[PDB]
Amino acid sequence: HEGVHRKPSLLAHPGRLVKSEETVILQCWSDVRFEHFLLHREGKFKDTLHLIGEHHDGVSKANFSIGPMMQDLAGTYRCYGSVTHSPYQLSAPSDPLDIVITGLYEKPSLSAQPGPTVLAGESVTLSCSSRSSYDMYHLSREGEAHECRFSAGPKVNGTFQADFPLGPATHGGTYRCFGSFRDSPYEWSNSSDPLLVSVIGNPS
Amino acid sequence: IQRTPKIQVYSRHPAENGKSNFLNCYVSGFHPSDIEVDLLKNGERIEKVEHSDLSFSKDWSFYLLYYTEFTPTEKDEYACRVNHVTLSQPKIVKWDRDM
Amino acid sequence: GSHSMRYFHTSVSRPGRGEPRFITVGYVDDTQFVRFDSDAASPREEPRAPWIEQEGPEYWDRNTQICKAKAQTDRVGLRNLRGYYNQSEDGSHTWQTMYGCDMGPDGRLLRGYNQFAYDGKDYIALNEDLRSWTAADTAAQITQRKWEAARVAEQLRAYLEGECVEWLRRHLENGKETLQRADPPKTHVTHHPISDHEATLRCWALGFYPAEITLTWQRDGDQTQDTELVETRPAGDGTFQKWAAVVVPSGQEQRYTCHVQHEGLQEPLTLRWKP
Amino acid sequence: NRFAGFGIGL
Ligand SMILES: *[C@@H]1O[C@H](CO)[C@@H](O)[C@H](O)[C@H]1NC(C)=O
Ligand SMILES: *[C@@H]1O[C@H](CO)[C@@H](O)[C@H](O)[C@H]1NC(C)=O
């Protein structure tokens, strides 16, 4: 009859970028009366948590407190819902949500090319430099999120950097940069200094 | 890296027949740490044996002292049975007063 | 002379039996004063020397939470190493770690160290300068690149030249009677005939502290070979034992001399077997 | 006193 119930929703409050020792709340909600919620994290420290479902405004949610953030808690989380409990008739999995831990390593340098103040239409490439040998960098514009990931290289002056071509300069924004290592894609460094990119008109 | 244990069965004080003493079985220079050590009296296991806390040397090999109270005689034969992953058969080392 | 404080840790994974076993121990120059067992009823830093029992609950409560977090660090660490070396869960593995401080008569730090070992082989070690590392294999340089990226050696150096030597003199004064005392060895030679034409002389050394001692046999001038050097044994009361034996023929039972050196035996000793 | 230990792993 009901078969597999559809996916629940899964969010990270305040967000998926959790500093070390901080605590994040992983809410799991749906309009389906799920009397039981199962939170699962894949990877090297696989774990499953069970919280009961609280129902208000015909929505059923559960607030999974992740606890003081350590490296063993980073990873992609999925969520499941169930109405019965004799066995759990688990629903379809929620969308994966990658929870990362920040502040473990030295912050990198966020430079703008051709510069911080660019004129409209010009191509802009951001560079994530650091003397620490990060294998990859993560860049995000304020709010727009969608963190871009590029790899690095051991430059001559001892820095490891990545270039992020952004295309024609439109409205600019504020950008942040993180560093990480290959074997641990969810363990990020201290956030780089926020870089503001301003746009002006083309001279005529 | 695995290392065979070195076994030494000895007394804390010079053995005098009819005087209470401590029988020591000192295992050292072994890796990994999981070791089975028994103290034997005429072929029967001694249950009240205590051992030190696990520690290791500079080469990272572990050592352990197993001790129990005993009074040696002329005919009572004592021994130490050690079992380790590096050992095919469990090694048994009898007690000698001159060692 | 050159006294030292040393903390030893051993973390062994137990697949079919849940969490790893964590044994850690503390030493001040061959004497143990603290222990912490993961497999204890109420796991806590308990005293293992009579002179440390005077410490207030602040010492115990603070240092219990220390190795409590260290056991979790090793559980995470042992697990990571399995992926670094492409190993499965069904095997048991060991993660040894050891730090401390060497202090000389200049009243300050002489050598600091923080060494690590996986499965008995070296992994990564703090260098003598207290600022760089040394990795044993390509899998250990990874953590070096992370530990340099986290300025790990800076927190190391602050403790090594600082709280480590400070809590060393504090220990060497509150337990001066049992720590800054050298027990000279009791020495004698025994005779054990193995044949009608051969016999063995065994040089003994009993009840000495610390365990550092030299014991060699000499025949009319220094046979280190054909000498049965045995490893320094603990007596059980805080003293140590050692012996070396040499095989001689019948006759010429003399002119074989044994030599002992120690810190409680002030002038060097020479002795032979007297019937 | 023991070392507080670095929260970072290997
Ligand atoms: C949700 O989080 C709040 C704290 O913001 C907490 O009080 C509550 O127990 C959690 N769960 C539910 C079902 O509200
Ligand atoms: C990260 O930033 C915090 C806060 O500024 C600082 O306390 C910490 O030392 C930084 N860590 C590194 C590795 O730079």
Numbering used by the authors:
A (entry chain C): 1 to 204
B (entry chain B): 2 to 100
C (entry chain A): 1 to 221, 223 to 276
D (entry chain E): 1 to 10
What did the article's authors report about this structure?
HLA class I molecules are present on the surface of all nucleated cells and are one of two primary classes of molecules encoded by the major histocompatibility complex (MHC), the other being HLA class II. Their function is to display peptide fragments of varying length from within the cell for outward immunosurveillance by T cells and natural killer (NK) cells, allowing the immune system to differentiate healthy from diseased tissue. A putative archaic HLA class I allele of particular interest is HLA-B∗73:01 (B∗73:01). Further distinguishing B∗73:01 is that it is one of only two of the HLA-B classes that encodes the C1 NK cell-binding epitope formed by residues V76 and N80 in the α1 helix. Our results demonstrate that B∗73:01, an archaic allele that was likely reintroduced to the human population through introgression, presents a restricted repertoire of unusually long peptides with a preference for arginine at P2 and a hydrophobic residue at the C terminal position.
Second, we were able to solve the crystal structure of B∗73:01 in complex with KIR2DL2, loaded with a 10mer peptide, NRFAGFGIGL (KP1), to 2.9 Å resolution. Our complex shows the general binding mode of KIR2DL2 onto B∗73:01 is grossly similar to that seen for other KIR complex structures published to date. That is, the KIR binds directly over the F pocket of the heavy chain, making no contact with b2m with the D1 domain generally making contacts with the α 1 helix of B∗73:01 and the D2 with the α 2 helix of the antigen binding region. Interestingly, however, when compared to other HLA/KIR2D complex structures (including KIR2DL2/C∗07:02, KIR2DL3/C∗03:04, and KIR2DS2/A∗11:01 (16, 45)) the docking angle of KIR2DL2 onto B∗73:01 is shifted ∼15° toward the α 2 helix. A contact map and buried surface area analysis of the intermolecular contacts between KIR2DL2 and B∗73:01 compared with those of the complexes of HLA- C∗07:02 and C∗03:04 with KIR2DL2, show that the D1 domain of KIR2DL2 uses considerably fewer contacts (6 VDW and 1 h-bond) to engage the α 1 helix of B∗73:01 than with the α 1 helices of HLA-C∗07:02 (14 VDW, 3 h-bond, and 1 salt bridge) and C∗03:04 (11 VDW, 2 h-bond, and 2 salt bridge). In contrast, the contacts between the D2 domain of KIR2DL2 and the α 2 helix of B∗73:01 have slightly more VDW contacts, and share the same number of h-bonds and salt bridges as with the complexes with C∗07:02 and C∗03:04. Together, this results in an overall smaller footprint surface area for B∗73:01 skewed toward the a2 helix, likely contributing to the “tilt” of KIR2DL2 on B∗73:01 relative to these other complexes. A close-up view of the buried surface area between the KIR and presented peptide backbones shows that Q71 of KIR2DL2 has a direct h-bond contact with the main chain nitrogen of P9 of the KP1 peptide, either a result, or cause of, the skewed KIR binding.
